[PDB]
Ligand binder design. Structure first.
Ligand SMILES: CN(C)c1cccc2c(S(=O)(=O)NCCCCCCCCCCC(=O)O)cccc12
Length: 130
């Protein structure tokens, strides 16, 4: 259901989320316009996500329910797991550096992929079109 090539269309509250994550103003302004594109293929409970943005092009592979390591654009390391909760992908991560929870949720809403982040009580959404 998540399959295909998704290109970011708009954000909600993403600058405040980046600020909470400790990102400086220049990098927030870059991050607001990162041209994030996700190419997602699901095979059984296994996903491959090609992440392309102005910061980096990387390939992510994960299996539902299996812990993996993932590094953010500035090298900040996360560990966590994606699971399917109803029709939503729920990504439960923790920052290695401070142990704090970072959650990502992926959902289809109509013809859009809604990617929601939470960190320390601050929400952001990045909404993609296919
Ligand atoms: C270039 N630099 C310094 C950066 C610019 C803008 C935002 C940045 C964030 S951030 O936390 O504010 N935004 C990124 C959030 C990404 C959360 C990813 C969730 C886990 C994905 C797992 C793999 C997948 O399923 O695709 C973290 C670290 C560096 C950032």
């Amino acid at each position: 259901a998540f399959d295909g090539t998704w290109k970011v269309d708009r954000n909600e509250n993403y600058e405040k989320f980046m600020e909470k994550m400790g990102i400086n103003v220049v990098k927030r302004k870059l991050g607001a316009h990162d041209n994030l594109k996700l190419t997602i293929t699901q095979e059984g409970n296994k996903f491959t996500v090609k992440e392309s943005s102005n910061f980096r092009n990387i390939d992510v592979v994960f299996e539902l329910g299996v812990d993996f390591a993932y590094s953010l654009a500035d090298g900040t390391e996360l560990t966590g797991t994606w699971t399917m909760e109803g029709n939503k992908l729920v990504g439960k991560f923790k920052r290695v550096d401070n142990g704090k929870e970072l959650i990502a949720v992926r959902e289809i809403s109509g013809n859009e992929l809604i990617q929601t982040y939470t960190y320390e009580g601050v929400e952001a959404k990045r909404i993609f079109k296919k």
